[PDB]
């Protein structure tokens, strides 16, 4: 039972690490997309120009 | 309308006892704007003089 | 001591609006017992003038001057008459000193100075210090005014005494940095101590007079005419006569019904009877019992205890609900199937009060509670002891009983259960007379009781002379 | 007809799908290696990981552009209910109390009933005074402003 | 200090007991005595709960108790932990009250909540885990205020006069929840509080300046607004150049008046025990700073 | 009352999970008979008894 | 016990049963026939 | 956003509320077997539930 | 226990040099986060032209107070202190601290050498002041607010000029007048009317409640309260109510004194016991 709990703890640490890395990756996508939108003028302005 | 008579001239439409009963069950409104609506007194008086 | 001082200041701060002068009283074992002193909850006082008129009511007259009604629907005025009565009593501050004391030493051990005309000690097992106000309706005070004192206990029971302003003022009016009012009140002290009785000379209490009172400054006038005292005595006579006129109403009703029926009494109470008996001696015992009941009837008769719950505020509304309930239309099939189930009607057992009068050794019991129910086989009444035991006095040849039902129907029962039956008529009594004499006290909130109604109140308040007081 | 006309102004909100175009290497993305901080507690431990991202705009002119491609609902009701000014200006009254009460009853606007802490906070600082309707079948109240 | 407290159970705990006692980890439970080892009867409010005596009595007992956070349960031992000032803890709200971020939290006896079920917990024999309510300050001083006003108003009134007013006073509405105060009896403690209220109000009325007295009348002459309408209406049914202008008199009177006002405020204000800054979006726990 | 801690300790079968709507939406609008939602790391699974 | 039973049986069928009982002049037994005792139930708006 | 378009049908205990609400219909002596089109709109208790 | 602050604006040599002078000063932030934007830093976000000092004093009460402890780059690091531990803090208020003072936080009243401005935003930090000076500043402001309806008189002008000036150990400065353009800001106005309303309601209700409680136990304290009331009424003499309205008056009294709890009370935040000779900074024990 101590072995089972030790495995459970290692696995929840591993799941937390993987989930946090994936969260940072999705966050980088989100941050980049938000950056582009601040610099992306509408169609009517760019076609006018 | 003459076709409607099977409904129109039934007693249940012409007796208001359930309507008056549910009108009394609720009691008067407590709302300040509705309160001016409750203010009215009728008094029967002798007709002699 | 502090109650007298605070009450003096309070009656001064209120004098212009009320014109009530502060009367400082001390009570001891001559007016109340130790249990009643320790468990006292309220003191209330009432002012009535030289014409018998209370100062809470309209100055010229009231709609309560009309006679009573005999209707449970009216209940002798209902909520409005009850409220007019409750408005008539005013509440007084009081403090109990529950251990034995000697009054003058107690006042000297406090801050006061005492310079009485003769230094006679008065000793008292306990003391209640309270202040009542007698109303000078102008800067004028009459000797024919009477003041009522009411002492009330946690179960709602009360005791009334009444004494007229002439007894109180017989001598007192017949002779007529910065300082704080407290220090000069204590320094100026007491110089009078007078013993006053109520009108009927049942109870003695002492009046305490202070020289710092604002009473002294006013130089208002006092007078007692003879005709005013005469009218006040007549009003007092009408006051105390209220229960006896009801007793005589019942007596005349019994004799009137007995004349009307021709002496034929039908059975109304269950008791197996024999023909082979000297029923004539039972009639003679009935005569002796009906004389003796008049000999010994009192305020604690069954008739007063039957009318008293009628005077309560809930009574009229509850009676109207009962009238609607008994005369309700028979339910339709829809209501029985789909609607709510009908209200349960009156319970099979009623609560009554009775006067049990035994002739052999003259004795009359008055405030007797019995439970009554109609037996199924024959619709006669079974009268049971409030512990659930059948009452045996129907079988004793030397006892007659007068019952009064909660709806003021009365029976007068002979041995065997043959009874005279009629109704108590209240029409000889003005609505105010009954209503003020016998209305039950309703409690205002105080220490140690629930704000919500109907709760089981916890341990009742007490001031203990036998124990070291808790704080 | 009172003798003057109204120009009513209304804003309606739409839920929309966007289309963004961007050119190859139109921006540079400099990112560091993430750092972590530890936040201790009696029964839990919290780790905060943060990463710096700073971007440079590599084009001269606009290198990216957005289209409003598809709308797929209107959030608001597109109705004809005007903006309650008494809710916007909760402190103003008429100097005469009789006409104030009469005006508020005629227009159908509720005066505050008691001086609670929330009543004072509403009058002085402001609050979401206009409570939600019981049911809403048309989405949001697009209030109409009158000039 | 006794940083940890062992609570031993005399009843053998079933599987269900250990489960539900485990789910209660981080709940705030009080102990009367602050001892290293206690028995399960002393745990919680059940030792004192008594509905014939009033709400104020249980309030007085509770405000003097020692509060702990529940930890891991083992065989017949529960292991209570005392929080310490200035540190950060995770706390559980078994109460139905909502917590918003930044709230200051107080401890009070439980109120009556509509459904009447109230979730009895750990009925071991005829003992029960009666936990207090951890309530944010606004509701806390609202209940204290309403309770004091019931005591102060309902004196010398009959039950007929009292009834509707105290029915209206017992119900409190807070963040779209509705609660009722169980047993508001007129205690000895409540009469002490009322006496302090009367003395503090007397000193407010006596030692207030003429400026502090007459500001509202002058503003009403000058100004008109809904707030001023309400303030005037409170004074209505009882309803110039200063002849003295004295900054030192004003300062003396005001520094005394603030003292009396703090005295009057302490009758309503409770002790903050927690301050929240993180709320689980299901409102079942919070991260809090412990205070005392 | 379900034994969620065993569900956490026991081995599981990894599946592609498909909800039409957001997981939090179908949980919040009561699609499921039994639910347990918790935030952070819940120690409940570790105390085996 | 009677109040308890009346609180349980609050449907049109049960109240109608009681009304049909009290409505006629016959005694109960000239109106009731005894079937056996029950052991199985499948639940439904018309139950078996 | 009006109060109603038929005061005699949308209120509690109006004519059509006592006519077509099944709870009022059974305080009247209605025959349950006949189907009623108005019942779905007027059985306000079923609607609340 | 570090909180990261990032600047959404171009920093410069003089901005970072200006910011590094504050590397122990007290900066309040609206709520506890791990990563906040500079807009939340300081009291600037709350400043407006209609509410003013009392509103700031209320808002500053339930902010989280923090010490600046680095500038790593484009980011600022803030350390949130814990109760009881000893910390180094910078004095930047109008006064000097001695050993063993109890220090309070006030919204600032004077503002150049400190001010880091960027993009209409500027770092504004509270005053750290010993408790007596905070109490006296507070009372002076409140009294200036109550004099606000009779500035028409020359003596009251002189009295307000005397109230504005406060002297405290080797320092002297003028508290600004809460009356601007003859008018008092909204929150100071409601604070003043709450004080006056609680005074009037007390003077109206006290007699009835003294009578009611003296009917229970006529203690000597109630005697002295009733005497004081009677004296007060004699002074006023130089020239029934319903249950609902009684409950309304009681409730209004209590809700009005709830409005004053920010003014009447005064939290100690730091206790100072070690001072640099410069009086620029001291080490203090944190209270929270």
Curated annotation (Swiss-Prot), chain A:
Q: Specify the signal sequence span.
A: none
Q: Which domain of life is it from?
A: Viruses
Location of this chain's protein in the cell: Virion; Host nucleus
Q: How does it assemble?
A: Homomultimer. Makes the hexons and eleven out of twelve pentons. Interacts with triplex proteins 1/TRX1 and 2/TRX2; adjacent capsomers are linked together in groups of three by triplexes, heterotrimeric complexes composed of one molecule of TRX1 and two molecules of TRX2. Interacts with scaffold protein; this interaction allows efficient MCP transport to the host nucleus. Interacts with capsid vertex component 2/CVC2. Interacts with the small capsomere-interacting protein/SCP.
Q: Which family does it belong to?
A: Belongs to the herpesviridae major capsid protein family.
What job does the chain carry out?
A: Self-assembles to form an icosahedral capsid with a T=16 symmetry, about 200 nm in diameter, and consisting of 150 hexons and 12 pentons (total of 162 capsomers). Hexons form the edges and faces of the capsid and are each composed of six MCP molecules. In contrast, one penton is found at each of the 12 vertices. Eleven of the pentons are MCP pentamers, while the last vertex is occupied by the portal complex.
Instruction: Spell out the protein name for this chain.
Output: Major capsid protein
Provenance organism: Human cytomegalovirus (strain AD169)
From the UniProt record, report the name of the gene that encodes this protein: MCP
Q: Which residues of the full protein are shown?
A: 148 to 196 of 1370
From Swiss-Prot, chain C:
The biased composition feature labelled Acidic residues covers 61-76
Source organism's superkingdom?
Viruses
Principal place where this protein is found? virion
Keywords associated with the record: Capsid protein, Host nucleus, Late protein, Viral genome packaging, Viral release from host cell, Virion
* Protein's cellular compartments: Virion; Host nucleus
One GO cellular component term noted in the UniProt record for this chain? host cell nucleus
Q: A Pfam family name for this chain?
A: Herpes_UL17
Map out region (Disordered) in residue numbers.
52-77, 322-347, 454-471
Which GO annotations describe the biological process of this protein? chromosome organization; viral DNA genome packaging
Its subunit composition reads: Interacts (via C-terminus) with capsid vertex component 2/CVC2.
Family under the similarity heading: Belongs to the herpesviridae CVC1 protein family.
- Annotated function: Capsid vertex-specific component that plays a role during viral DNA encapsidation, assuring correct genome cleavage and presumably stabilizing capsids that contain full-length viral genomes.
Q: Which HAMAP family match?
A: HSV_CVC1
What is the name of this protein?
Capsid vertex component 1
Organism whose genome encodes this protein: Human cytomegalovirus (strain AD169)
| Encoding gene, per UniProt annotation | CVC1
Swiss-Prot record, chain E:
Kindly give the InterPro entries that the UniProt entry links to this protein: Herpes_capsid_2
Q: What is its main location?
A: virion
For the keyword Signal, the answer is no
Give the GO molecular function terms.
Answer: structural molecule activity
What stretches pass through the bilayer? none
A Pfam family per the record: Herpes_V23
- Tell me if Nucleotide-binding is a UniProt keyword of this record: no
Q: Where in the cell is it found?
A: Virion; Host nucleus
Keywords assigned by UniProt, alphabetized: Capsid protein, Host nucleus, Virion
Query: What's any one GO cellular component for it?
Result: viral capsid
Function, as annotated: Structural component of the T=16 icosahedral capsid. The capsid is composed of pentamers and hexamers of major capsid protein/MCP, which are linked together by heterotrimers called triplexes. These triplexes are formed by a single molecule of triplex protein 1/TRX1 and two copies of triplex protein 2/TRX2. Additionally, TRX1 is required for efficient transport of TRX2 to the nucleus, which is the site of capsid assembly.
> Which family would the database say this protein is a member of?
Belongs to the herpesviridae TRX2 protein family.
Task: Report quaternary structure and partners.
Answer: Interacts with TRX1 and major capisd protein/MCP.
**HAMAP family this protein is in?**
HSV_TRX2
State what protein this is by name.
Triplex capsid protein 2
UniProtKB/Swiss-Prot annotation, chain H:
Q: Which superkingdom? A: Viruses
**Localisation:** Virion; Host nucleus
Q: How does it assemble?
A: Homomultimer. Makes the hexons and eleven out of twelve pentons. Interacts with triplex proteins 1/TRX1 and 2/TRX2; adjacent capsomers are linked together in groups of three by triplexes, heterotrimeric complexes composed of one molecule of TRX1 and two molecules of TRX2. Interacts with scaffold protein; this interaction allows efficient MCP transport to the host nucleus. Interacts with capsid vertex component 2/CVC2. Interacts with the small capsomere-interacting protein/SCP.
User: What is its biological role?
Assistant: Self-assembles to form an icosahedral capsid with a T=16 symmetry, about 200 nm in diameter, and consisting of 150 hexons and 12 pentons (total of 162 capsomers). Hexons form the edges and faces of the capsid and are each composed of six MCP molecules. In contrast, one penton is found at each of the 12 vertices. Eleven of the pentons are MCP pentamers, while the last vertex is occupied by the portal complex.
- Which family does this protein fall into? Belongs to the herpesviridae major capsid protein family.
Protein name (Swiss-Prot/TrEMBL)? Major capsid protein
Give the source species.
Human cytomegalovirus (strain AD169) (HHV-5)
Interval of the full protein contained in this chain: 1225 to 1273 of 1370
């Amino acid at each position: 039972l101590d072995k089972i709990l030790n495995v459970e703890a290692m696995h929840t640490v591993l799941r937390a690490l993987k989930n946090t890395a994936d969260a940072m990756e999705r966050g980088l996508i989100h941050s980049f997309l938000q950056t582009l939108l601040r610099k992306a003028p509408p169609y009517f302005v760019v076609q006018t120009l | 309308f003459v076709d409607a008579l099977k409904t129109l001239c039934h007693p249940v439409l012409h007796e208001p006892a359930p309507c008056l009963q549910t009108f009394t069950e609720r009691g008067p409104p407590s709302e300040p704007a509705m309160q001016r609506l409750l203010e009215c007194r009728f008094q029967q008086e002798p007709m002699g003089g | 001591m502090e109650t007298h001082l605070y009450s003096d200041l309070a009656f001064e701060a209120r004098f212009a609006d009320d014109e009530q002068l502060p009367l400082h009283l001390v009570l001891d074992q001559e007016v109340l017992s130790n249990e009643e002193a320790e468990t006292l909850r309220y003191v209330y006082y009432r002012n009535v003038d030289s014409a018998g008129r209370s100062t809470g009511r309209a100055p010229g007259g009231d709609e309560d001057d009309a006679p009573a009604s005999d209707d449970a629907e009216d209940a002798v005025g209902g909520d409005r008459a009850f409220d007019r009565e409750r408005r008539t009593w005013q509440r007084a501050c009081f403090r109990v000193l529950p251990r034995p004391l000697e009054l003058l030493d107690y006042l000297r051990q406090s801050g006061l100075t005492v310079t009485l005309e003769k230094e006679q000690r008065v000793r008292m097992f306990y003391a209640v210090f309270t202040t009542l106000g007698l109303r000078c309706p102008d800067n004028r005070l009459s000797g024919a005014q009477t003041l009522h004192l009411r002492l009330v206990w946690p179960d709602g029971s009360y005791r009334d005494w009444e004494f007229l302003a002439r007894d109180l003022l017989r001598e007192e009016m017949e002779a007529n940095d910065e300082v704080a009012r407290t220090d000069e009140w204590k320094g100026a002290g007491v110089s009078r101590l007078r013993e006053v009785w109520d009108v009927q000379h049942r109870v003695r209490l002492r009046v305490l007079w202070y020289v710092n009172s604002f009473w002294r400054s006013r130089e208002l006038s006092y007078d007692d005419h003879e005709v005013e005292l005469y009218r006040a005595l007549d009003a007092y006579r009408a006051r105390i006569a209220v229960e006896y006129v009801l007793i005589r109403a019942v007596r005349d009703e019994i004799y009137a019904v007995l004349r009307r029926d021709g002496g034929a009494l039908p059975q109304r109470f269950a008791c197996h009877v024999s023909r082979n008996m000297s029923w004539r001696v039972v009639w003679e015992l009935c005569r002796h019992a009906l004389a003796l009941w008049m000999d010994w009837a009192d305020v604690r008769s069954c008739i007063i205890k039957a009318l008293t719950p009628r005077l309560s505020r809930g009574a009229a509304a509850a009676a109207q609900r009962a009238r609607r309930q008994r005369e309700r239309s028979a339910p339709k099939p829809q209501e029985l199937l789909f609607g709510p189930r009908n209200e349960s009607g009156p319970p099979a057992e009623q609560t009554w009060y009775a006067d049990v009068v035994r002739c052999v050794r003259a004795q009359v019991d008055l405030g007797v509670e019995v439970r009554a129910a109609r037996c199924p086989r024959t619709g006669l009444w079974i009268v049971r002891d409030r512990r659930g035991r059948l009452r045996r006095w129907l079988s004793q040849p030397e006892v007659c009983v007068l019952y009064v039902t909660p709806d003021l129907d009365f029976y007068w029962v002979l041995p065997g259960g043959f009874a005279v039956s009629s109704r108590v008529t209240l029409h000889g009594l003005a609505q105010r007379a009954l209503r003020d004499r016998f209305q039950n006290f309703e409690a205002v909130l105080a220490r140690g009781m629930h704000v919500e109604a109907g709760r089981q109140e916890p341990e009742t308040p007490r001031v203990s002379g036998r124990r070291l007081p808790f704080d | 007809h009172p003798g003057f006309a109204l120009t009513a102004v209304r804003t309606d909100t739409f839920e929309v799908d966007m289309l963004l175009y961007s050119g190859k290497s139109c921006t540079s993305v400099i990112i560091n290696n993430p750092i972590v901080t530890k936040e201790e507690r009696d029964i839990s431990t919290t780790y905060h990981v943060t990463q710096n991202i700073n971007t440079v705009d590599m084009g001269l002119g606009y290198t990216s552009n957005t289209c409003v491609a598809y709308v797929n609902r209107v959030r608001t009701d597109m109705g004809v209910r005007v903006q309650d000014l008494f809710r916007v200006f909760p402190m103003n009254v008429y100097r005469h109390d009789e006409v104030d009460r009469w005006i508020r009853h005629a227009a159908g606007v509720e005066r505050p009933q008691l001086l609670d802490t929330e009543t004072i906070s509403m009058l002085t600082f402001g609050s979401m005074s206009e409570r939600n309707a019981a049911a809403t079948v048309h989405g949001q109240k697009a209030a109409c402003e009158l000039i | 200090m006794e940083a940890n407290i062992f609570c031993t159970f005399d009843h053998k705990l079933s599987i269900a007991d250990v489960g539900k006692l485990t789910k209660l980890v981080a709940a705030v439970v009080p102990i009367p005595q602050r001892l290293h080892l206690i028995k399960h009867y002393q745990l919680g409010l059940h030792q004192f709960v008594d509905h014939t005596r009033g709400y104020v009595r249980l309030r007085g007992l509770l405000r003097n108790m020692t509060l702990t956070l529940m930890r891991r349960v083992e065989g017949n031992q529960i292991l209570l932990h005392v929080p310490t000032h200035g540190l950060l803890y995770t706390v559980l709200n078994t109460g139905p009250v909502t917590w918003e971020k930044g709230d200051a939290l107080c401890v009070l006896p439980p109120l009556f909540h509509g459904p009447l079920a109230r979730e009895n917990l750990l009925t071991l024999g005829q003992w029960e885990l009666v936990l207090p309510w951890i309530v944010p300050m606004p509701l806390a001083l609202e209940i204290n205020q309403r309770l004091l006003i019931m005591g102060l108003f309902s004196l010398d009134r009959s039950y007929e006069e009292v009834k509707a007013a105290v029915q209206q006073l017992q119900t409190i509405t807070f963040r779209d929840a509705t609660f009722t105060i169980p047993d508001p009896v007129i205690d000895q403690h409540l009469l002490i509080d009322m006496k302090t209220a009367c003395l503090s109000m007397s000193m407010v009325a006596n030692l207030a300046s003429e400026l502090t007295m007459t500001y509202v009348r002058k503003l009403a002459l000058e100004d008109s607004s809904m707030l001023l309408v309400k303030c005037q209406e409170l004074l209505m049914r009882l309803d110039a150049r200063p002849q003295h202008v004295s900054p030192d008199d004003e300062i003396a009177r005001l520094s005394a008046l603030f003292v009396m006002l703090r005295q009057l405020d302490d009758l309503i204000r409770e002790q903050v025990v927690f301050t929240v800054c993180d709320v689980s979006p299901d409102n079942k726990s919070a991260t809090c700073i412990f205070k005392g | 009352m379900e034994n969620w801690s065993a569900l956490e300790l026991l081995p599981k079968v990894g599946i592609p999970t498909d909800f039409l709507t957001h997981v939090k939406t179908s949980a919040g609008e009561e699609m499921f008979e039994a639910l347990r939602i918790y935030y952070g790391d819940d120690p409940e699974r570790y105390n085996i008894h | 016990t009677r109040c308890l039973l009346e609180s349980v049986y609050t449907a049109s069928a049960a109240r109608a049963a009681l009304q049909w009982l009290d409505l006629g002049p016959h005694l109960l037994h000239r109106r009731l026939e005894t079937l056996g005792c029950v052991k199985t139930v499948s639940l439904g708006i018309t139950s078996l | 956003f009006a109060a109603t378009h038929n005061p005699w049908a949308s209120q509690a205990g109006c004519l059509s509320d006592v006519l077509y609400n099944t709870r009022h219909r059974e305080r009247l002596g209605y025959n349950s077997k006949f189907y009623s089109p108005c019942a779905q709109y007027f059985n306000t208790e079923e609607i609340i539930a």
